[PDB]
Amino acid sequence: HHWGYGKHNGPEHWHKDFPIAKGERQSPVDIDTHTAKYDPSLKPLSVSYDQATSLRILNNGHAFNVEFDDSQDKAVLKGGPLDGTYRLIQFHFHWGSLDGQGSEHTVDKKKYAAELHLVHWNTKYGDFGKAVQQPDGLAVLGIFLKVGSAKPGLQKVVDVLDSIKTKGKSADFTNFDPRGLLPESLDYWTYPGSLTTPPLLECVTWIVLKEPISVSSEQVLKFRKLNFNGEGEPEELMVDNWRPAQPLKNRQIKASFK
């Protein structure tokens, strides 16, 4: 596994090692707001993060992950399109080199400056590694970021990034409340898709919030100071760590709202 985001190892190459890259339910996708259809069968969405227990932040050479204790049903996602209970395991972001790109999903071809992914696994499968092998194994809550006013609840993340500059560095990251990263509205679009990095497994129910959160230019500039490289290696800024939109194929995008 030597994949990344550059010319030589980026998204256009992934299919060689991971042929599912050209599969029937790949992510991300463009969300055509006019075509997406309100679905009255969707049950109310339930984001229950009050007992979330963050543990650590890790630069893995692709993004940074904020990791949670998922040894029990602390923070969970239910409802909406979902049957059963999905436990929060981690969140991370994808972002650009400039404010006009960075998101993975697009909205009528619009690219946001970044996209937050809150990753949850279906507890009926017992562990995350088993869940990723199932078509309904994961639920990813995707939230767009635009540049404007600062997001206060993001600043503790921003301020630890200096300590995890390079690939393989981690830091303690306890007591972080992911509720501070949500927008006011839980209106969403949903469709069946995949992981957006290798191994590209077709195991995700996507729930993409319609309302972006606002972050400041200063906050996102700090994301852009991270490195893809390890300590001591030539600097490669961690920017443009997004996969472009993939073919929708035989899928419909459903809206939770009228």
Ligand X SMILES: COc1ccc(C[C@H]2SC(=S)NC2=O)c(OC)c1
87 sits near Zn ion (criterion: CB under 5 A)? no
Count of residues of this chain found to bind ligand X when the rule CB under 6 A is applied: 10
The one among 52, 66, 140, 157 contacting ligand X by CB under 6 A = 140
CB of 44 to Zn ion, least distance (A): 25
Determine contact, residues 65/57, Cβ cutoff 8 Å.
yes
Q: Which is nearer to Zn ion, 117 or 210 (CB)?
A: 117
167 sits near Zn ion (criterion: CB under 5 A)? no
Determine contact, residues 17/1, Cβ cutoff 8 Å.
yes
Does the bond joining 135 to the residue before it have cis omega, within 30 degrees of 0? no
103 sits near ligand X (criterion: CB under 6 A)? no
Site for Zn ion in 109-128 (CB under 5 A): 117
Q: Where would I find the H helices in the chain?
A: 128-131, 155-160, 217-223
* Known catalytic membership, residue 15: no
Residue 190 binds which of ligand X, Zn ion, none (CB < 5-8 A, kind-dependent): none
Distances (CA, A) of 94 to 97, 127, 135: 11, 25, 23
Helix (H, G, I), strand (E, B) or coil at 158: helix
Nearest CA-CA partner of 111 in 86, 77, 75, 145: 145
- Region near ligand X per CB under 6 A, out of 37-45, 47-55, 145-153, 195-203: 195-203
Q: Which is nearer to Zn ion, 117 or 222 (CB)?
A: 117
Q: Summarize as ranges the residues that interact with ligand X (CB under 6 A).
A: 63, 92, 117, 119, 132, 140, 195-197, 199
